[PDB]
Structures are given as C-alpha cells and as structure tokens.
Write a protein that binds this ligand. Structure first.
Ligand SMILES: Nc1nc2c(ncn2[C@@H]2O[C@H](COP(=O)(O)OP(=O)(O)NP(=O)(O)O)[C@@H](O)[C@H]2O)c(=O)[nH]1
Ligand SMILES: [Mg+2]
Lengths: 166, 77
C-alpha cells in the first residue's frame, strides 16, 4: 500500500505538539515541551482505505535550521501550522513556503493551512485574512483547536487529499 | 543539547532533552506514552558507535543524564 509522509512545519508556542498527538493517542497536551525531531506513525483508514500516516513534526525554534533541507525533500506533503492568536506565526508562513519551495523546486507542493487554537478569543488574525494568503499559494485553509478536537481529523485527512491530487 | 536520539519501534524516532537528576523511566514517559507503547513491555538499547549494528541492553533505572550526546534504541519484547 501507499505510505503518506506528513511533515509538520510551524513556529513556536503554537499547537503542533498537540495536533499530531491528539490524532494518534487522542490526547490534548498543555506543558510547553520544546520539541526537536519527533516522528509518529498510525494505521488509519482514510476514504475506505486502510492507510498509514508517518508524521514528522519539526522545531519552530530557529536553532535547528540545518537539517531542514534533509526531510523536506523526503516528505510527500507539508503542513503549515499556526495559531490565529499569534501574529508573528502568520507572518512567517511566507518564509516557510519560499523555503519549502527552495528544497523540492516545484510550486505544486501538496500542502494545507491550519489555524490552530480557534477555541480562544485572542483572534488577531481573521479567516479571510488567512484565506486571501492561502489563496495565493493555492492551498486550502482549515481552522482547528487541539484543545477541543476541532478540525483535528480534518487536518491529517484533507492534506492527504491534496497528495491524492498529484 | 544535551540530547539523546532515541529510536522507537514501528520505524519511528524521538530526540529528548535530559536534565540532571532524571533517570530513563521518568523523562521517557510523555515521549513514549503518546504512541500507545507501554515502557514495561519495551526494551532499551544503546547503539554502539564502534561496530554499528551491535547494541547493548541497559536498565530503565539508569540516569540518562550521563548519556548526553549519544543515541539509543527501543525494542519491543
Ligand atoms: N488554548 C489552546 N492552547 C493550545 C492548543 N494547542 C496547543 N496549545 C498550547 O500551546 C502551547 C505549546 O504547545 P506545543 O504544541 O508544544 O507547541 P509547539 O508548536 O509544539 N512548540 P514547538 O514548535 O517549539 O515544538 C502549550 O501551552 C499548549 O497548551 C489549543 O488548541 N488551544
Ligand atoms: Mg513541537
């Protein structure tokens, strides 16, 4: 069968280490634990097909910006994760895509956008404010909250659908 | 770093940061309990970097604070 490689790219303070967790073990994680390089795997059934999700979440802290250009030509699909309560994470999306495009050359990279923490009220970054940005890259936009299981499944499902287009 | 690159079963991996005073059973909970695998029924190896392929088993009650800059390997019994 086919093995889908989901690379999770995002900044710090967001909800990367809560989305990838609440899909495999279905658990929400508080405690800010500075991740560096963790890989995950789960036997899932996406679209009447028992598949496999080899997820690999990355570090948002730019103290490990060396091995970036190693697995970003390995992963079949990417996942830009930010939070609508953090503006700086929204402004660093442009420096992600251009650095992802830098690796695997193409502009047709199977990606999808995730606006985590939609259960808060610190929204400084609206939906269309992010949709108009995601429109430029041509990838969809999904709004999630890894605290209440909202849009969690849709994140690691709709992304696979983007891989099932190319 | 101050890190220990630990490889988990099912072709997975995880790198953890270890503070002094922490063993290898306390600082490896949340970095393993989030995958379903129980530490009780899982082994522990330290990949020797002189032969590359022959690891040595250890004890879970070992201070992992001393293995800074190494590389482990976890197997299921
Ligand atoms: N309210 C709320 N807080 C969340 C949510 N998801 C994550 N958080 C919070 O975000 C903080 C950091 O979580 P974490 O997932 O570790 O962030 P990260 O992106 O993994 N950090 P790093 O990039 O450095 O590994 C924690 O305090 C956690 O409680 C969410 O859906 N809602
Ligand atoms: Mg993380």
């Amino acid at each position: 069968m086919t093995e889908y490689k989901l690379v999770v790219v995002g900044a710090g303070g967001v909800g990367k280490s809560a989305l990838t967790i609440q899909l495999i073990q279905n658990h929400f994680v508080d405690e800010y634990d500075p991740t560096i390089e963790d890989s995950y795997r789960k036997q899932v059934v996406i679209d009447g097909e028992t598949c496999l999700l080899d997820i690999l979440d990355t570090a948002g802290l730019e103290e490990y910006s060396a091995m970036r250009d190693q697995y970003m030509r390995t992963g079949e699909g990417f996942l830009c994760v930010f939070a609508i309560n953090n503006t700086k994470s929204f402004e660093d999306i442009h420096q992600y895509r251009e650095q992802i495009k830098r690796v695997k050359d193409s502009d047709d990279v199977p990606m999808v956008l995730v606006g985590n923490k939609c259960d808060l009220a610190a929204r400084t970054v609206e939906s269309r404010q992010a949709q108009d940005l995601a429109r430029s890259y041509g990838i969809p936009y999904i709004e999630t909250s890894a605290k209440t299981r909202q849009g969690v499944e849709d994140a690691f499902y709709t992304l696979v659908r983007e891989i099932r287009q190319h | 770093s101050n890190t220990i690159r630990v490889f988990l079963p099912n072709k997975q991996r995880t790198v953890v940061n270890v503070r002094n005073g922490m063993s290898l059973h306390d600082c490896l909970m949340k970095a393993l309990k989030v995958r379903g695998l129980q530490p009780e029924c899982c082994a522990v190896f330290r990949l020797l970097h002189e032969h590359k392929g022959k690891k040595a088993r250890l004890d879970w009650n070992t201070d992992a604070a001393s293995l800074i800059g190494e590389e482990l390997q976890v197997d299921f019994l």
